[PDB]
Amino acid sequence: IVGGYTCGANTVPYQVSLNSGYHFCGGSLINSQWVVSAAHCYKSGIQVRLGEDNINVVEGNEQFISASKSIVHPSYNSNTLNNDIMLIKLKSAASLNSRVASISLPTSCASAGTQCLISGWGNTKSSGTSYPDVLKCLKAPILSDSSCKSAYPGQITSNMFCAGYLEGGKDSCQGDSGGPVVCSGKLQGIVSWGSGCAQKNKPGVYTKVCNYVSWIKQTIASN
Numbered sequence: 153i154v155g156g157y158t159c160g161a162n163t164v165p166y167q168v169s170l171n172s173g174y175h176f177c178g179g180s181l182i183n184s185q186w187v188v189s190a191a192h193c194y195k196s197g198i199q200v201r202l203g204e205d206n207i208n209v210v211e212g213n214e215q216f217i218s219a220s221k222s223i224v225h226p227s228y229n230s231n232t233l234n235n236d237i238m239l240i241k242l243k244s245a246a247s248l249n250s251r252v253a254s255i256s257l258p259t260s261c262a263s264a265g266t267q268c269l270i271s272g273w274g275n276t277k278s279s280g281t282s283y284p285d286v287l288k289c290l291k292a293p294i295l296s297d298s299s300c301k302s303a304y305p306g307q308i309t310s311n312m313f314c315a316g317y318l319e320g321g322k323d324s325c326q327g328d329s330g331g332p333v334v335c336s337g338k339l340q341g342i343v344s345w346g347s348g349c350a351q352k353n354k355p356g357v358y359t360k361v362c363n364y365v366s367w368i369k370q371t372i373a374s375n
């Protein structure tokens with residue numbers, strides 16, 4: 153997250169870290185046994201880390217649970233990043249409380265202008281690299297589809313939306329991928345892609361979760 157603020161320990165209780173020996177992507181806990189992330193975060197041997205703030209210090213509220221199954225969307229295209237969403241089943245149910253909780257799925261799509269919260273452990277610099285150890289947060293609005301398509305001609309599908317600031321300065325970045333965009337208490341987006349981080353006229357692009365609710369619910373019910 154570039155240009156954000158320190159969330160505070162366990163203030164984003166649905167945020168997960170995907171670990172393969174090291175943090176490599178974010179994710180969101182959507183019930184006791186299932187996590188949603190970005191398909192471009194796929195890899196084998198994932199451990200899901202819940203209750204994290206400092207990802208390099210054991211602070212006492214963590215739950216570390218291995219993945220038993222990963223399901224990439226049937227229509228994920230890695231060249232265009234269309235349908236950039238994946239479901240991960242935990243080997244055992246997590247223990248839910250105030251500091252570790254699920255985020256609700258949307259019933260409706262969110263409209264442009266709605267303010268959302270984006271969070272992650274990704275790079276904090278637009279030029280160069282500095283990775284935080286504690287969770288960072290950013291408040292940002294959903295941009296109109298017209299402005300999003302104007303920023304990225306030819307690249308934006310119905311399954312994507314832009315959020316952020318056309319002036320630059322504030323954005324998600326590498327290492328935030330997979331993580332949540334939450335608006336009015338619902339999961340509306342997944343951190344997916346963009347052209348660099350925090351640049352002028354290049355906002356972040358996010359997977360539009362409202363289009364996938366039926367696939368998520370049917371997949372969870374049969375796996």
Ligand SMILES: [NH3+]Cc1ccccc1
Nearest residue numbers: 324325345346349356
């Ligand atoms: N600035 C959007 C973004 C770029 C690369 C990875 C994740 C997010």
Ligand SMILES: [Ca+2]
Nearest residue numbers: 206209210211
């Ligand atoms: Ca920790």
